[PDB]
Amino acid sequence: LVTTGELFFRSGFGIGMRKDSPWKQNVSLSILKSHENGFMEDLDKTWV
Amino acid sequence: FMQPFQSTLWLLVGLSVHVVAVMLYLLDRTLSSAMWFSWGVLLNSGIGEGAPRSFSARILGMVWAGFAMIIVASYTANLAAFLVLDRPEERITGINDPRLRNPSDKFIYATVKQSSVDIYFRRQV
Amino acid sequence: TLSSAMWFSWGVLLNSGIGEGAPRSFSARILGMVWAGFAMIIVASYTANLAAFLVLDRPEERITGINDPRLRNPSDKFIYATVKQSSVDIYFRRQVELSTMYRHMEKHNYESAAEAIQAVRDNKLHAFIWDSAVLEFEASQKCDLVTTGELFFRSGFGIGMRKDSPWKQNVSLSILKSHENGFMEDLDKTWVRYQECLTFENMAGVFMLVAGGIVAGIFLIFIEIAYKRHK
Amino acid sequence: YVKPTLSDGTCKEEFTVNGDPVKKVICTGPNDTSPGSPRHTVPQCCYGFCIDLLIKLARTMNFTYEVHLVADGKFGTQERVNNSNKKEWNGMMGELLSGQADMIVAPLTINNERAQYIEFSKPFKYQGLTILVKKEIPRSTLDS
Amino acid sequence: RSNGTVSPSAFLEPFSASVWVMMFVMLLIVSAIAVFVFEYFTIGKAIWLLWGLVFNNSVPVQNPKGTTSKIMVSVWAFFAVIFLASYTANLAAFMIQEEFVDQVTGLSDKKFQRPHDYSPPFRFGTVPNGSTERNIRNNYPYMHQYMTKFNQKGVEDALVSLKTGKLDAFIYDAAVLNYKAGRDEGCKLVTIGSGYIFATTGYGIALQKGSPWKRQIDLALLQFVGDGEMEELETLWLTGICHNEKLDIDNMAGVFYMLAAAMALSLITFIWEHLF
Amino acid sequence: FTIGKAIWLLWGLVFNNSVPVQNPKGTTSKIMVSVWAFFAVIFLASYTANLAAFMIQEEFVDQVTGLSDKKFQRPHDYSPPFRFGTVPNGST
Amino acid sequence: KFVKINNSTNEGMNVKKCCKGFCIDILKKLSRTVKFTYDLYLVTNGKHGKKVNNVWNGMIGEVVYQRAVMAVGSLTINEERSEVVDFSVPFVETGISVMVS
């Protein structure tokens, strides 16, 4: 199979939780920190 | 094989070549040897066994060789054109392609009955 | 037979079929056949390259429409035209993006209609914006230019009057009737409908070399005769 | 089409392939053409698409024409007058808002700003813009 | 058109002109020079060998033999190779291009003036109670008197019947015709003219006679035209599917006829030679 | 000599007929020579068409991919000193 | 922009320059939709933002010390930036890329 054509409606994934929850700011900050310290790159390399 | 233009075209061309050779040999007044030589010349076999009688036959043979070279050039041009025309089926270009924007009966697609594509398509009027 | 062998080897690559060289060594014959095959492949590749160059010869990328990115972005390589700063310049002023683009032709607008085409024919400018009828007639009559692009700001011509004059209704009705009568098409056919409009150089840049070689053949034969007579 | 008149002032002797003489009229435009000279306004010869249309219109209607070419040259635009704080119509449109006026016939264009002051008729042509550039010289001739 | 329009154009080449005569005389001069060099009865053999080397290298002849003659033969072979390569490139370029001509290219055509005495009778496709019907009847009645035979109910039915082959030509408005042809099934339909319109008149909004809205509506519509909104509207709502996007048996009939004529001429020449 | 003549004739018919010899004798030999010549001509025409169509392709070379490289990771040595330009006081 | 000359002549008045671009279009759209009015003004105190001696300077500083409300422009999300101010959802993509001759 092939995947021709350009792409539209670009908006990435995310982890959801209810409007009130004590984990919100910590979760977002942890994702950013792991991202940039070089973690999502390695996981992308080794899984997809 | 020699399919792309017409098989009947090659059959007619061969019949015309044989008829031209037959009239040429009638004009001489080694017919089999001459026919083999002509076949080799048109196939570039280079037998070289032809024995023309008159200069008119020589001129006719030169004209026939030129016509055969022209036919070979046309056949090679057709082959090159077909090679250039590779990938007959084009590629759909995103959502802006009119042939996919306009629904038809030969194209069918669908994503998921409960997803985000559903929301994106329903909200965008 | 060394000279004959050299001539035969030279003529093999050109389908001469001289057959003046029969080397004694079998390996020499095998190498000659391999070289002939290599030469055939090389000449076939050259013909393919020439055909591809002829087919893909298209270095022209003239601006198509106003929305073309090259035409959208001003550059000092060449300038635009505006033709006396009337009719069209109002349209360019109205649009904000066209207002920004108008900085290029604001200081360089001409003052007439034929001066711009004369300057274009002087190769001091390759650009023009004007009514489609005039440009099309100029291209047809003067078989030197071509018009490329898509029509935009389509708005017909018209007979002008003043405020509210007592002749408007009859004039407009007469124009519509003349349209529906077939008279207008006949007139447009009789005024602007017919204005006049294996390369030769391919057989000229190679026939000159053939003529030069034919001329030099006599000199070469004389030189060979002199060399033979001297020894 | 504008052409200099005959030396006797009777510009004539023209015909078409179909054996039809070309209808002609005489204008009184700027003989010197270029500005700065002492305008002569000598009679000249004018003929073309609009002239034929005007002839047909005059024959169908009942009036007489005294065609005179424009003096300035510009098609016509609104512009602020120099050393003032107002604005006015220049160019060929200027003669419309004065005594000359009459029934201006020319390759005009239907525009909002133009139509806000004068009133047009149904168009007798349809056109676009069609950007024009000089033709490219074909250097691919297999010379080398 | 029932089948695709393909034009082999077996004679559209720039040959058979002063260039061809110049090439022929240059060829004859080169052959004569080669004959003289070889001599420095074989003229015919040398001419045949040179003609073959131009066309096909399977022509045996022993007329030219030498060193300067070898150089001339090599130069001629290189020239012939260049010429055939250029001809193949020109054929490729021609295959790139296309040549399509109009079917009728005329509304006041001979076909639409007396089609009874021209081929099997033609077809007139209109609709009743329209604007085209009134104008066509008022211009020249005879086409209308003929046209009463075929007048469909609408547009879809007429197009379907035409695709079935019952009709040959359908005369109607311009904008709907362009939209229908552009968005057709397989782009197998096209207008007879290359986008040729006959009686150009635009659409309009039919306000009441002397209604107190004409000025505002006209000015607003002209303003809409000026600001380019109509261009975007036409792009969104009015665009077809294709529009601008886009050695056989019957290809070699002319060259075959020419070859037959040349063979007959050669036979006549041989008969004349035998007479003398 | 017959084997060598046949081999030379086969090679010529594959490549170019400029090497004639009196190798084939009989109608069957002529027929097979013609068949071989036709096959070679068709193959050469197909090869020329493929070579002509090959020109519509043009690849690219990217070599390294990212900041993980010997030139990037190793600061010094190599042989020509490198350059690592980046505007300071930002995020990068 | 707070225009300043050189040396002690840096005492200058608020000159009026008009600015436009990609982010300004976003700002205008947000003003039209959310219905708020703004007082756009350029910053001349630093750069995109860097912490020196436990002090923030440039855009981020202007938001940290309650001297502004938004900081529209070419800001980039980060870890330490997001511990003192609250960002919106990203509307462009961006990384750390390499350009060579």
Tab-separated table of N, CA and C in Angstrom, chain G:
chain	number	residue	atom	x	y	z
G	1	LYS	N	7.808	51.802	19.741
G	1	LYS	CA	9.074	51.399	20.335
G	1	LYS	C	9.666	52.530	21.159
G	2	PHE	N	10.253	52.175	22.297
G	2	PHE	CA	10.921	53.147	23.152
G	2	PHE	C	12.264	53.534	22.549
G	3	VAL	N	12.263	54.516	21.653
G	3	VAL	CA	13.465	54.876	20.909
G	3	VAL	C	14.434	55.600	21.832
G	4	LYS	N	15.680	55.137	21.851
G	4	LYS	CA	16.745	55.749	22.630
G	4	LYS	C	17.944	55.987	21.728
G	5	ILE	N	18.568	57.155	21.872
G	5	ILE	CA	19.725	57.506	21.057
G	5	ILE	C	20.959	56.808	21.613
G	6	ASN	N	22.020	57.573	21.858
G	6	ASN	CA	23.279	57.027	22.338
G	6	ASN	C	23.791	57.855	23.506
G	7	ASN	N	24.561	57.205	24.373
G	7	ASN	CA	25.173	57.829	25.559
G	7	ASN	C	24.039	58.356	26.443
G	8	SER	N	24.165	59.562	26.999
G	8	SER	CA	23.112	60.122	27.836
G	8	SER	C	21.919	60.620	27.032
G	9	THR	N	22.042	60.724	25.710
G	9	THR	CA	20.946	61.168	24.858
G	9	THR	C	19.893	60.089	24.640
G	10	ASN	N	19.978	58.974	25.366
G	10	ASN	CA	19.016	57.889	25.225
G	10	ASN	C	17.624	58.264	25.713
G	11	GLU	N	17.474	59.391	26.404
G	11	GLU	CA	16.160	59.841	26.855
G	11	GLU	C	15.333	60.196	25.627
G	12	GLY	N	14.400	59.314	25.268
G	12	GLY	CA	13.640	59.473	24.051
G	12	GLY	C	12.160	59.256	24.290
G	13	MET	N	11.374	59.680	23.309
G	13	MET	CA	9.927	59.579	23.378
G	13	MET	C	9.443	58.340	22.635
G	14	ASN	N	8.186	57.981	22.884
G	14	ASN	CA	7.599	56.811	22.251
G	14	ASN	C	7.273	57.083	20.789
G	15	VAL	N	8.191	56.730	19.889
G	15	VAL	CA	7.913	56.875	18.469
G	15	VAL	C	6.842	55.875	18.049
G	16	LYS	N	6.136	56.207	16.976
G	16	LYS	CA	5.018	55.398	16.499
G	16	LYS	C	5.432	54.679	15.221
G	17	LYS	N	5.709	53.385	15.342
G	17	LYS	CA	5.989	52.513	14.213
G	17	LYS	C	4.865	51.497	14.092
G	18	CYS	N	4.491	51.154	12.867
G	18	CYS	CA	3.430	50.183	12.638
G	18	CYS	C	4.019	48.863	12.163
G	19	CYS	N	3.606	47.774	12.812
G	19	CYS	CA	4.185	46.453	12.633
G	19	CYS	C	3.117	45.465	12.182
G	20	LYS	N	3.504	44.534	11.312
G	20	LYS	CA	2.576	43.518	10.830
G	20	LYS	C	3.331	42.232	10.534
G	21	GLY	N	2.590	41.134	10.436
G	21	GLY	CA	3.215	39.854	10.158
G	21	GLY	C	2.266	38.707	10.447
G	22	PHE	N	2.846	37.514	10.599
G	22	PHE	CA	2.038	36.321	10.831
G	22	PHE	C	1.371	36.362	12.198
G	23	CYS	N	2.138	36.665	13.246
G	23	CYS	CA	1.576	36.670	14.590
G	23	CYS	C	0.573	37.797	14.781
G	24	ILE	N	0.780	38.932	14.113
G	24	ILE	CA	-0.157	40.041	14.244
G	24	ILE	C	-1.519	39.671	13.672
G	25	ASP	N	-1.555	38.866	12.609
G	25	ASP	CA	-2.839	38.399	12.099
G	25	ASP	C	-3.564	37.551	13.136
G	26	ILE	N	-2.827	36.684	13.830
G	26	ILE	CA	-3.418	35.897	14.908
G	26	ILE	C	-3.950	36.814	15.998
G	27	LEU	N	-3.183	37.847	16.348
G	27	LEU	CA	-3.622	38.779	17.380
G	27	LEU	C	-4.898	39.497	16.971
G	28	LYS	N	-4.980	39.932	15.714
G	28	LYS	CA	-6.181	40.612	15.244
G	28	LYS	C	-7.382	39.676	15.244
G	29	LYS	N	-7.187	38.421	14.833
G	29	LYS	CA	-8.289	37.465	14.860
G	29	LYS	C	-8.770	37.222	16.284
G	30	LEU	N	-7.837	37.097	17.228
G	30	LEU	CA	-8.222	36.915	18.623
G	30	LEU	C	-8.955	38.136	19.157
G	31	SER	N	-8.504	39.333	18.784
G	31	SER	CA	-9.197	40.544	19.206
G	31	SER	C	-10.617	40.578	18.663
G	32	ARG	N	-10.794	40.179	17.406
G	32	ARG	CA	-12.127	40.170	16.814
G	32	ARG	C	-13.032	39.150	17.493
G	33	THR	N	-12.498	37.970	17.816
G	33	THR	CA	-13.342	36.905	18.350
G	33	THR	C	-13.624	37.093	19.838
G	34	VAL	N	-12.574	37.137	20.661
G	34	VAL	CA	-12.743	37.241	22.106
G	34	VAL	C	-13.207	38.623	22.544
G	35	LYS	N	-13.150	39.618	21.656
G	35	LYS	CA	-13.647	40.969	21.921
G	35	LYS	C	-12.901	41.626	23.089
G	36	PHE	N	-11.617	41.881	22.846
G	36	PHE	CA	-10.804	42.705	23.729
G	36	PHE	C	-10.003	43.690	22.891
G	37	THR	N	-9.624	44.808	23.505
G	37	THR	CA	-8.839	45.844	22.847
G	37	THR	C	-7.448	45.899	23.462
G	38	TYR	N	-6.441	46.160	22.632
G	38	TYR	CA	-5.050	46.013	23.029
G	38	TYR	C	-4.271	47.304	22.803
G	39	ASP	N	-3.039	47.314	23.307
G	39	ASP	CA	-2.158	48.480	23.279
G	39	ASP	C	-0.745	48.071	22.869
G	40	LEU	N	-0.644	47.349	21.752
G	40	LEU	CA	0.604	46.751	21.277
G	40	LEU	C	1.793	47.696	21.398
G	41	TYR	N	2.941	47.147	21.799
G	41	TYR	CA	4.153	47.942	21.953
G	41	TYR	C	5.377	47.037	21.979
G	42	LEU	N	6.430	47.445	21.273
G	42	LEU	CA	7.660	46.669	21.197
G	42	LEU	C	8.462	46.776	22.486
G	43	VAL	N	9.400	45.848	22.653
G	43	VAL	CA	10.222	45.755	23.852
G	43	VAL	C	11.675	45.976	23.469
G	44	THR	N	12.352	46.867	24.198
G	44	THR	CA	13.798	47.051	24.072
G	44	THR	C	14.388	46.980	25.477
G	45	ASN	N	14.570	45.761	25.961
G	45	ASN	CA	15.288	45.532	27.207
G	45	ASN	C	16.128	44.267	27.181
G	46	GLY	N	16.213	43.564	26.054
G	46	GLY	CA	16.831	42.255	26.018
G	46	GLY	C	16.479	41.455	24.781
G	47	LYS	N	16.011	40.231	24.982
G	47	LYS	CA	15.778	39.289	23.895
G	47	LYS	C	14.576	38.428	24.273
G	48	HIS	N	14.447	37.264	23.630
G	48	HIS	CA	13.319	36.379	23.902
G	48	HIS	C	13.216	36.014	25.377
G	49	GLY	N	14.338	35.948	26.087
G	49	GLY	CA	14.291	35.700	27.515
G	49	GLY	C	15.380	34.790	28.040
G	50	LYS	N	16.077	35.233	29.082
G	50	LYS	CA	17.142	34.452	29.691
G	50	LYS	C	17.269	34.851	31.152
G	51	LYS	N	17.466	33.861	32.017
G	51	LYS	CA	17.529	34.086	33.458
G	51	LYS	C	18.978	34.323	33.860
G	52	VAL	N	19.282	35.543	34.294
G	52	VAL	CA	20.611	35.910	34.770
G	52	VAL	C	20.467	36.442	36.187
G	53	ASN	N	21.171	35.815	37.132
G	53	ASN	CA	21.149	36.215	38.539
G	53	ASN	C	19.726	36.214	39.098
G	54	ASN	N	18.994	35.134	38.817
G	54	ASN	CA	17.623	34.951	39.300
G	54	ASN	C	16.719	36.107	38.875
G	55	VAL	N	16.903	36.579	37.645
G	55	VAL	CA	16.126	37.687	37.103
G	55	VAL	C	15.825	37.397	35.639
G	56	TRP	N	14.592	37.678	35.224
G	56	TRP	CA	14.147	37.451	33.855
G	56	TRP	C	14.144	38.767	33.089
G	57	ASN	N	14.615	38.731	31.845
G	57	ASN	CA	14.714	39.924	31.015
G	57	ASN	C	14.223	39.621	29.609
G	58	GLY	N	13.373	40.496	29.077
G	58	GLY	CA	12.919	40.381	27.703
G	58	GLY	C	11.681	39.528	27.537
G	59	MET	N	10.634	40.090	26.929
G	59	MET	CA	9.322	39.453	26.862
G	59	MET	C	8.919	38.769	28.158
G	60	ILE	N	9.584	37.662	28.494
G	60	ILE	CA	9.201	36.905	29.678
G	60	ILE	C	9.240	37.792	30.913
G	61	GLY	N	10.289	38.603	31.052
G	61	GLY	CA	10.330	39.540	32.162
G	61	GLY	C	9.119	40.451	32.187
G	62	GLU	N	8.747	40.994	31.026
G	62	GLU	CA	7.600	41.887	30.950
G	62	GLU	C	6.301	41.208	31.343
G	63	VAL	N	6.268	39.880	31.415
G	63	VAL	CA	5.059	39.192	31.844
G	63	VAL	C	5.228	38.718	33.279
G	64	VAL	N	6.470	38.478	33.696
G	64	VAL	CA	6.687	37.969	35.046
G	64	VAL	C	6.407	39.052	36.079
G	65	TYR	N	6.824	40.286	35.800
G	65	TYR	CA	6.703	41.383	36.749
G	65	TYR	C	5.422	42.187	36.569
G	66	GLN	N	4.378	41.580	36.008
G	66	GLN	CA	3.055	42.194	35.905
G	66	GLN	C	3.085	43.507	35.126
G	67	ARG	N	4.013	43.636	34.184
G	67	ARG	CA	4.072	44.803	33.316
G	67	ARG	C	3.345	44.594	31.995
G	68	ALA	N	2.716	43.441	31.803
G	68	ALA	CA	1.953	43.144	30.599
G	68	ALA	C	1.013	41.990	30.918
G	69	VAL	N	0.285	41.528	29.903
G	69	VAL	CA	-0.640	40.417	30.054
G	69	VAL	C	-0.333	39.286	29.083
G	70	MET	N	-0.083	39.603	27.820
G	70	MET	CA	0.293	38.611	26.829
G	70	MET	C	1.681	38.935	26.300
G	71	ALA	N	2.271	37.981	25.594
G	71	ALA	CA	3.592	38.171	25.014
G	71	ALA	C	3.645	37.572	23.616
G	72	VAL	N	2.633	37.870	22.804
G	72	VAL	CA	2.525	37.325	21.454
G	72	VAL	C	3.810	37.586	20.682
G	73	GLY	N	4.163	36.681	19.793
G	73	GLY	CA	5.377	36.815	19.022
G	73	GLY	C	5.953	35.443	18.696
G	74	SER	N	7.282	35.363	18.725
G	74	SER	CA	8.010	34.154	18.368
G	74	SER	C	8.474	33.363	19.588
G	75	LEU	N	7.691	33.353	20.663
G	75	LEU	CA	8.070	32.601	21.851
G	75	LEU	C	8.038	31.107	21.569
G	76	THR	N	8.842	30.359	22.315
G	76	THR	CA	8.886	28.910	22.204
G	76	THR	C	8.645	28.278	23.566
G	77	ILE	N	7.823	27.228	23.592
G	77	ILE	CA	7.514	26.555	24.845
G	77	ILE	C	8.755	25.827	25.344
G	78	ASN	N	8.859	25.677	26.657
G	78	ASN	CA	10.038	25.075	27.253
G	78	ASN	C	9.658	24.547	28.629
G	79	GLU	N	10.652	24.058	29.369
G	79	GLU	CA	10.416	23.562	30.718
G	79	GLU	C	10.519	24.672	31.755
G	80	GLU	N	11.630	25.413	31.758
G	80	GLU	CA	11.806	26.464	32.756
G	80	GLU	C	10.924	27.670	32.472
G	81	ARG	N	10.618	27.936	31.202
G	81	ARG	CA	9.710	29.031	30.879
G	81	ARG	C	8.317	28.765	31.423
G	82	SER	N	7.879	27.510	31.393
G	82	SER	CA	6.521	27.160	31.781
G	82	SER	C	6.353	27.002	33.283
G	83	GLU	N	7.415	27.175	34.060
G	83	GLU	CA	7.312	27.130	35.510
G	83	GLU	C	7.008	28.485	36.129
G	84	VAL	N	7.075	29.568	35.356
G	84	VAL	CA	6.769	30.895	35.873
G	84	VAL	C	5.599	31.561	35.159
G	85	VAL	N	5.302	31.203	33.908
G	85	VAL	CA	4.164	31.739	33.176
G	85	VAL	C	3.371	30.573	32.606
G	86	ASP	N	2.152	30.862	32.169
G	86	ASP	CA	1.258	29.851	31.622
G	86	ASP	C	1.112	30.077	30.125
G	87	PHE	N	1.454	29.067	29.336
G	87	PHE	CA	1.387	29.167	27.888
G	87	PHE	C	0.034	28.690	27.379
G	88	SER	N	-0.274	29.067	26.144
G	88	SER	CA	-1.446	28.563	25.451
G	88	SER	C	-1.070	27.300	24.684
G	89	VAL	N	-2.018	26.751	23.939
G	89	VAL	CA	-1.696	25.573	23.125
G	89	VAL	C	-0.855	26.008	21.933
G	90	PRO	N	0.100	25.203	21.478
G	90	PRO	CA	0.927	25.617	20.344
G	90	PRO	C	0.106	25.768	19.079
G	91	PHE	N	0.485	26.746	18.260
G	91	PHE	CA	-0.154	26.944	16.969
G	91	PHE	C	0.811	26.849	15.794
G	92	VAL	N	2.100	26.605	16.042
G	92	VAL	CA	3.073	26.292	15.003
G	92	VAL	C	3.937	25.151	15.523
G	93	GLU	N	4.629	24.479	14.613
G	93	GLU	CA	5.610	23.473	14.985
G	93	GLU	C	7.015	24.048	14.875
G	94	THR	N	7.922	23.520	15.691
G	94	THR	CA	9.269	24.062	15.796
G	94	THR	C	10.147	23.061	16.526
G	95	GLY	N	11.406	22.968	16.113
G	95	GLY	CA	12.356	22.119	16.801
G	95	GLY	C	13.714	22.767	16.941
G	96	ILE	N	14.768	22.006	16.661
G	96	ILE	CA	16.135	22.513	16.603
G	96	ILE	C	16.752	21.901	15.354
G	97	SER	N	16.758	22.644	14.257
G	97	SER	CA	17.187	22.101	12.980
G	97	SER	C	18.531	22.684	12.571
G	98	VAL	N	19.106	22.081	11.532
G	98	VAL	CA	20.456	22.377	11.067
G	98	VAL	C	20.391	22.785	9.602
G	99	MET	N	21.094	23.857	9.259
G	99	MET	CA	21.224	24.325	7.887
G	99	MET	C	22.699	24.445	7.539
G	100	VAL	N	23.081	23.893	6.384
G	100	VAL	CA	24.457	23.926	5.903
G	100	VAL	C	24.457	24.244	4.415
G	101	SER	N	25.625	24.652	3.922
G	101	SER	CA	25.768	25.079	2.537
G	101	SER	C	25.741	23.880	1.600
